Structures are given as C-alpha cells and as structure tokens.
Design a binder for this molecule. Sequence first.
Ligand SMILES: [Zn+2]
Lengths: 149, 135, 246, 101, 42, 97, 113, 194
Amino acid sequence: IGTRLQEVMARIHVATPMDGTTRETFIPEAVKNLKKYDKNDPNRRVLARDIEEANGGAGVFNVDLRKDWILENPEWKYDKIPEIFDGKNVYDYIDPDIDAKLQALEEEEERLEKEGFYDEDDEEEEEILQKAEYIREQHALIRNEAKMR
Amino acid sequence: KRGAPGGKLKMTLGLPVGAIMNCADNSGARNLYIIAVKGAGARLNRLPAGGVGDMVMATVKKGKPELRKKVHPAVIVRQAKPWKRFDGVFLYFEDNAGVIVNPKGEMKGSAITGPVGKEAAELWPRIASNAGVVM
Amino acid sequence: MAVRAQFENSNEVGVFATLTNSYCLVALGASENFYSVFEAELQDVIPICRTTIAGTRIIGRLTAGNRKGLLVPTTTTDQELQHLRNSLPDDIRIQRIEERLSALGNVIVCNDHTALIHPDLERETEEIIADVLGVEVFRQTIADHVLVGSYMALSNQGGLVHPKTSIQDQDELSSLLGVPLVAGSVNRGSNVIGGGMVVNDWLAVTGLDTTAPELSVIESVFRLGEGAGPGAINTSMKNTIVESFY
Amino acid sequence: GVFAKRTMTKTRRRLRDLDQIERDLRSPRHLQQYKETKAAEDLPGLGLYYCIECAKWFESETSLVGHRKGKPHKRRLKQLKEGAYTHEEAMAAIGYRIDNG
Amino acid sequence: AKSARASRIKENHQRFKKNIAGPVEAARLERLSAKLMAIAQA
Amino acid sequence: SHRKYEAPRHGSLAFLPRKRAARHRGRVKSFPKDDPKKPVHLTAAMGYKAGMTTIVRDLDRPGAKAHKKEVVEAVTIIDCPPMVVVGLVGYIETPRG
Amino acid sequence: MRIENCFFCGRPAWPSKGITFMRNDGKAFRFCRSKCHKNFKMKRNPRKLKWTKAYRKNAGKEMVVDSTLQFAARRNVPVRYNRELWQKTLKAMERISEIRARRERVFYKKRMA
Amino acid sequence: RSLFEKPVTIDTIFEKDEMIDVIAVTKGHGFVGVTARWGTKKLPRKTHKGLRKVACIGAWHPSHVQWTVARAGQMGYHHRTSVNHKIYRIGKGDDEANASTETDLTKKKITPMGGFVRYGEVNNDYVMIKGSVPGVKKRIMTLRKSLFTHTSRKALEKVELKWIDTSSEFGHGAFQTAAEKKQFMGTLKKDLQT
Ligand SMILES: [Zn+2]
C-alpha cells in the first residue's frame, strides 16, 4: 500500500475505545426548545449586529461590558470598583472572610494592649553625656588646629 | 496582499537590514539574516528596519543546507531593543529571534522554542497557535 | 450544527473563541459579528462573555476550561479576572494559574471528563487542573506535537485530531479518552485543529474556508444535528473522503 | 581579565543566570532544553566537556579539571551554596504571598 | 489617497460638523455661557 | 544637472523667519468667527505652565486596538488662577481692516 | 491597574516606571528604575546590597512575623463584586495600616534597645 | 460692563473633554548650526572646514545665496499656535483631592512630592492637557477656543481617569505620598532622635 493510500486509510479510519463505553453528555434541555435563527423571519431574535447597526455601526457603537454582569444586587452593575487606596491594592485585600480575621486582629490588639506591648518608658547620665560631647568637640578643635599648622 | 500587517501600533524598531537573528522554530535554520523589511518606506540613506510582529525577508546563514539558497518571509517574534507598549510598559527580550513563514503568514515549522511577543501573537494567528508561552 | 464563521476575515476561530458546555468566551473586536454568530447559535442558553486576556485577543489560545471550571494565565489582570467572575455564574470555578507555559489553550485540551496536557507542565499545575476542572489529567503528545490544545479539538461526543496521526496512536488515545477520535483537517487542509475550530456537545464553529467533506467529518465525529454519528465516516462518507483527501 | 569589557553589559553579551544554573542542577530536563538551544558541533570539545556550575563549555577534560581548581569556579560554588535570588525570595522580602484558595 | 483639500473630504467634514459635533458643542456652549452669565449677574 | 536621488526639503518654509518672537506673551492671531445667534461667551484665557505628569486612562475608542483597555499617557499641567476683567475694547470695520 | 513591586529592591513599581526584562525561560523581571536594572545586568545579588528589602529581610531588620502581613496576597481565585465587601475592605485596609505602623515602631525600638 | 472688576475662573470658559488651542513662545536655544537647526546630514569624519555644515549653499545660478538654503542662526523662542489639545481634567484649587479619581481613593493634590521642579506648587485651579504644549515651565500660555467645529471622534470622546501620577519628578520617585514613603521605609534613626 502506497504512502498516500495509507494516509487516506488513516483519514477514513475511526478509532473507538475497546471497552465500548461512552462518556456522559451535558447538553442543556433548552437546546431542544430553541427555535433556529432565520434572517428572513420577521420575528427573529434581535442580535448585537442589529443593535450596533441601529446605534452607529461598527467603530462608532460602544458596547456595554457590564450589561451582562450577574450580581447579588443589580444596582451595583455600573459602580466604579476601587483599585488603589493609599499606595495599596484593594484586590490584594479582597477576601470573603475579612470580618472574622479583622475581629481576631482586634482581639489580638486589645490583648497586647492589656499585656503591655505598646507601653513606652538619669540626670547623671545626661551630665556625663554632655561632658563626653564637650570633650569630643575639644578633640575636633585640636585636630583642626593640627590640620591648619 | 503584501506581508505588512494591519492594525500594528508604533513601536521602537530594533532590527535593521544586515541584522542576524536566531531562528525560533524547528524549520532547520539556526539564524536569519535580514535583507528587507515589508512595508518599509522610502527615505534617503535610511536603513529599513522592523520590530516584533513585522515581516522581513531573510536568508539563512547557518543551518540546514537546502534552506541556505532561498529568501524566506519571516516574522520577528523577539527583539532585544527595548520598546513601549500602550500600557506604559517598556520591555525587551534577551535575544532577537524570528520564525519562517509563507506570505500568507502560515509557519514553515511546527514548534516554537521560547516565548513570542504579544504583537507577533496578536497579528499572526498561526504563531499564537504554535506558541507555548506569550509574553 | 457546525457553523462556518470568521473573526475579522480570519478563519482561525479557535484562536479568538473558547467554547465549553456551560459558557462561551469571545474576543472583543471592532464589530459584533463574531459575537453575534455565537449569539445566534446560543440564544441565551449559556452566557457569552466578551473578554480580554493580558491585553490580547487570543483568548482561545490563552484560556482553557470546561463546564466546571476556567483557567486563565498569570498575566491576566485583576480587572479582566473580575469581569470574567462577574459574567460567569458561581457554578463555574475560575482560577488564575502560575504555569510557565501560559498559552493554556495551547497546552491544555479538555472535556468534562478528561484533560490532555503538554508534558512539561508543573505538578502543582496538574493538581490545579484536576481540582478546578474535576477531570483526569494525562500528559500526552498528539502526532509528535506537544501543543495538544491547538492540535486537537475535544468534546464529550468525540474528538478530531491532527491528520498525520498514526492509526495505533488514535486507538491508544481513544482508549485513554473514552471518546471516538477521527484524524481530519479544518480550514481547507490546515492541521491546527484547536486553533481552527471550537466545539461543545451540541455546537461546532469552524472557519469559513472549511470545506464540505471535512465539515461533514466534523459533523459526524461530534454528533451534531439529527442522525449524526462517527460510524457514518467509513460507510456513507467513505467515498467522499477518499475522493477529496487522496 | 574580561574580553571587551566596554560592551560587557550588552544584551548580546549576556551570560546564563544563577537561578537557571540551580534549576539545571536540580532537573536535567531544563539543562537538556538549554543544550538543545545550542549546536553540538560548534561547541568546544564538541560539547562533551561542560561545567554546569560555570555554565561553560571546555575544549578538554583536563581543561575542565583545570578550571575547577580556579577561583571563578569556587565563586560560583559559593554563590550556589548561598542560593540565587528568585521571585519567591522577592515576595518573602516584602511579605507578599500567593493565595491559590 | 484623498488629500485634506479634497472636495469630497470637505463635504464629509461639513456633514460631520452639522450633524454630530454641532449639538455637542452647542450644549457645551450653553452650559459655559450660563455659568459665566451667572458670574456676570452676580 | 538634476539630482540623481530625490529627497524632500529639510524644514518648512511656512515658519520663516527662524527669529526670536517679538513678544514674550503669545498673540492670538485669530479668534473664532462670531455668530450672533449664540449666547455670549469668552474665547480665550491665560495660565502658567507648571510641568507634566503621567496618568492612566480608561479608553473608550471604538474600532481602536486599546478599546476597553488602560493606556498610559503624558499630560501637561497648567496653573490657572482666575483672571480679572478690567477693560473693554471696541472694533470697527474699515477698508484697511 | 495595580502596583507592582521591583524584583531587585522591592520598591513600589507604579505604572510607566522602570523596565521589564523578558527571559527566554518564561520569566518577566520588573525593575522600578535603571539602578536596579543595571545592577541586575551586572548580576549583583540583591541579598548583599544593603539598600534592598532582600538584604533587610535576610538580616532580620524588617518585621516579617506579624498577623498584619497576612491580609495582602495575590488573589488567584476572584470574588464576585459586592459593594459592602469592598467598603469594609477599605476600612480594614486603613485600620490594618495603622496597626502595622504601630507594631513596626515597637519592633524598631526592640532593635535599638 | 457686568464683568468689570470681577474674577473669571477657568471652568466658566473651558470645560473638560474640550479640544483647545495653545499659543506660546517655545524654548530658546540661542545660536545653533544647521545640523540641529534644520536636521541636515552630517558631513563625513574630519571633513576640512567643518562637518556640522552644508557642503553646497549655491552650486547653481543665481550668483546669490537663496533664502531657501539652511543657515546657522537663532533656534527656538518662536511663536507657536498648536491646535487640537484635549482637556483631561479641570481641577479646583480648593479641592484637597483634585488628583484623586473614582478608582484611586488616595486624597492627594496635583503637585508631586518635592513640588514641581523649578516651578513650585499648584495651589489654584489647574488644567490638565493631553500631550505637550509649546512653552516651558513658568511661561505664560494662552488657551483659545478652537476656530472651527471639530471633525474627529477624539474631540467627542469622554475621558475617564483612573490614576494620576504624583511621584517626585526630581528623581526616580516611587511614592505618591509622604505617608506612603514612610509606610514603605519604616522607622528611621531620626524618628527616635526626635
Ligand atoms: Zn528597584
């Protein structure tokens, strides 16, 4: 059998699993109830091409990306979602379990405040430090005199 | 239709005529020597040049022998000269590299080694189909 | 129900679209024609999301998923991820992954039961695939190509693979996947099946240059419309296929 | 000394990074990919004498054994012992993490 | 290519001016004149 | 004889002479054409150039590649304290202008 | 948009700042400035340059073990948008910033005891 | 007559999303040779009597130098009218968050950290214009209404800002606010010294 003929044999060959089993399919039930779209049908479904043609054509019509959002409250569909706050990313801090962690943080904060973690604390020491600073100044003046001479 | 693609934004061209780039596919060639750039204008003393996503005409200086006698269309997928994208990001790759294609934009090879540019991937759908990583 | 379509005069539908059994993703363009093809075929049965991935329109070759999950690469932005999460219902799990081979539509091909991947994906990436998609994951090459998601189209009905696949390779792959597979081409002899077409359990969308014999092959192997089966290929369409592809 | 130190920082004069060197040491597949990006007949010693730590090819086995006694090879060894700098270390330096659910 | 001085380009621009940019510019002018007249009458 | 290779002119003759401006403050050479049916409004203003900065814009330009995407653009800031109106000049038409 | 961090030094990388190096293995390196970029091209270790967060974390001069650092992360599983959730997140960010500053000052004092 | 002795703010003459014209005198460069004044090609290396010159200023008749030949002279400080400049924001000086957007909730003003370099601080109403304008810093600029009705979609676009950079332009500023800089750096030696 020539190479071209084996190629068309491999094209017409249909491979099947040896066990004869089949996978479960997941076609939704609305597909059977769908009516096929026809251009000549006067009651056809209005499409995005139709809306774009009615609102300026291609390159003029501005599509609304938030129109098909699924939210808990549909009033939120056109909000300005925050992104930056005081040099920090809001999306870095977005967490569904935020209130429990924050309340645990508040418990920890009051625990360390009760334990004394943020608490804040001699004249002879100040005197000896002032004397040492005076001595260092005199040393610097002596070095400057040596550098001059 | 000439090989110059449409819908390309302005970027810094890093590869003039005479540049040797790496050959990033498995067509057998190892390097590509630029002799022309598609869509280049006319200006006195100016060398034609191309950036990432441009089609050039390239001869093979090193590689498989029967590729060494022809001039091939090629798409530049990586460049080392830094350029800016519209998001304000200046970026560059560590080498200059391209892939051999036909004038319709379909690739001669079957695999791409290394990343390709976003510009090349967005302008040539077969390079996006044969890219493993797009940067 | 196999439909010829084009995204801005390009026949590579699978580059710009991603089709599963519960949603469709279409690239944002300068017109509504490519969106309206899918809108006409899917009349609000499953949601269609106009989406952008990493600032690019090659979402079909950058995203992978099935009816249970969706996987986007690491360069997907927070706003694109939020738009996808808001457009899709909570039944679908969306995850951004850190995989090195970020062309997920190239390196992953999957249906609702099993997923073939590029053999150099990371182990935790395989874990994320098997978790979010809920499928069995196999590392396999098809016709010596490591980009399974671009060189294979797969559904629960069946699969169409690279035309130069060996018969024993198709047998091993069909036994591994549990679905019938046929070697064929799209877009008048193109071997990039995943880049050329998208498919789910009841709809296929190919490019405009897909010829009538290979369109009938796609119809039979994916069981589209009334009286469609992969056994029609070697009995009823055998003479047509031998005449066309010899 | 360094050959042509004036253009040492050019991108066309770039050398392989240390994290790539560790990944080549840890996994032979990454090293094999790097070696497949080269041509074997154009390498010193036909590619048969390679130092992964220095990421460098050598003309002979005695040349490889020779450079191992040198201090650049020992600098590469001590740098690998310290560990190269990665994005995981970069995130840990700022206290950033990845949430995968 | 049609030049910037071409008659058809001029007619296209005149139709755009009359039908599209005109109402927008008129509404902006009404708002600005109302604000500056409020200052003038204040 | 003729030039063997064509090349366009360096520079534009429209901006001659390349001399210093006769005044530091810029001169409005032409004002918009008066339409008596319009409401009364002012045609110009003054400010002081302070510098430039960077922004991120959310672009809505249908048909463009960066449509529905974010773009980084350079912008110039002009400090504009309010002007004070102190005078009124009347102009007549003559055969000399 | 979002704020990145410099790979080399860890400073906040705002839009149109710095440069990104694209490596052929699949790595993108974002640098906030040409200083970090040129040190990277010279292959200087950030862990040894004392002006970097890498050195400071290696030397233990940054507060790294604290509960207030567990709130910022790269979220790879998106959350459906909720106005009250975003508002309480904003309030949480403000309070967490205050608590982090106070604990950082305490940490520095225990360094300088 | 109604407007005499009265202040007129910028937002009662111009409005955000309007394209205006900017009239100003350009940056001065003094006396400049032909290479930078006109963009002429440099002569080859070690060309006798100069290579930043024009080789022939009149090889043909008439026996004169023509007015169309490039000559060294004054460059810059020219009067220029540049058209079609889009207004992106008219910020109010009394607003303490006039550099804040709907998505960036940092309350900040338009002035960068350390001030505008060689200008100072913008404490009044300001106009943000896309792109560059003919003047330099401190220079008086005249903003004019466009003479004709616009023909571009860009003039009808509505501008949506997400972020305005307020980092220092006196260097590689990585911080938008002093609070951000202090939060990133931490506690310094001078903080406990004070
Ligand atoms: Zn840095």
